[PDB]
Amino acid sequence: EGGQHLNVNVLRRETLEDAVKHPEKYPQLTIRVSGYAVRFNSLTPEQQRDVIARTFTESL
């Protein structure tokens, strides 16, 4: 068969950490959370915790 539907985020975890630090810097930063997209700044601190914690596949 094959997988169906996929959210694609190409980013580094550090960048998100930076975003948490200074939201003013990334006003239009958007990420795919679970089938939809949201501005990073829109999320709650707890909600953000969920995202950063998630797996970031690396090369190899």
- Continuous segment of H or E residues that includes residue 59: none
Q: What is the number of structural domains in the chain? A: 1
Going from the C-alpha of 24 to that of each of 30, 37, 51, 56, the distances in angstroms are 14, 19, 19, 24
- Determine the 3-state secondary structure of 55 from DSSP: coil
> Nearest CA to 45 among 9, 20, 13?
20
Parent domain of 31: 1-60
